[PDB]
Nucleic acid binder design. Structure first.
Length: 141
DNA sequence: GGTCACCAATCCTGTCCCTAGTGGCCCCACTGTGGCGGT
């Protein structure tokens, strides 16, 4: 699964019709987040889900925050955001309601967010998830 | 990234005229398109 996801990162710049900060995640990686088995049960994460996210944590690690956009500025939708947090979709809308998670362009007053349109950056959606500590994080070892 | 602030207001007092008048002349198309009983 790592080597399958490694070629998509190396050949990310090849596929670009627009800039990284304007392109969606499913345009480069393709369905690999919303196909993943859900963690609605117990808050017990799937071994497929543990392996996917732990690759994305080292992606933003290798792609620091510079003035040129890179692979860590790909746009993520509210459903793909809901899976990466492992919570309900209303709970992730409520974080948007109290401006905890910051969209990536301003909707103009009658814009209610399309649930499939890529709203948030991959970047700080991960950093929000690393603000919550669970036992098998890479920080301790 | 996107919109074009709310809260109330439209003035009262007086009047539109008087005089005189709307022309003469000539003309308004020829063709066709009838049924029925009788001497």
């Amino acid at each position: 699964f790592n080597t399958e996801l490694d070629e998509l990162s190396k050949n990310a710049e090849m596929k670009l019709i627009d800039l990284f900060n304007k392109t969606e995640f499913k345009f480069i990686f393709g369905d690999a987040i919303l196909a993943c088995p859900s963690t609605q049960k117990q808050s017990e994460s799937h071994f497929i889900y543990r392996a996917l996210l732990d690759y994305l944590v080292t992606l933003v690690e290798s792609n620091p925050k510079t003035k040129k956009p890179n692979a860590a500025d790909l746009l993520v939708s509210v459903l793909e955001a809901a899976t990466l947090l492992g919570t309900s979709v209303e709970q992730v809308y409520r974080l948007y309601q109290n401006g905890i998670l910051q969209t990536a362009f301003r909707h103009k007053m009658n814009q209610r967010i399309n649930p499939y349109k890529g709203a948030f950056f991959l970047r700080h959606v991960i950093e929000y998830k690393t603000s919550f500590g669970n036992d098998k994080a890479r920080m301790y070892l």
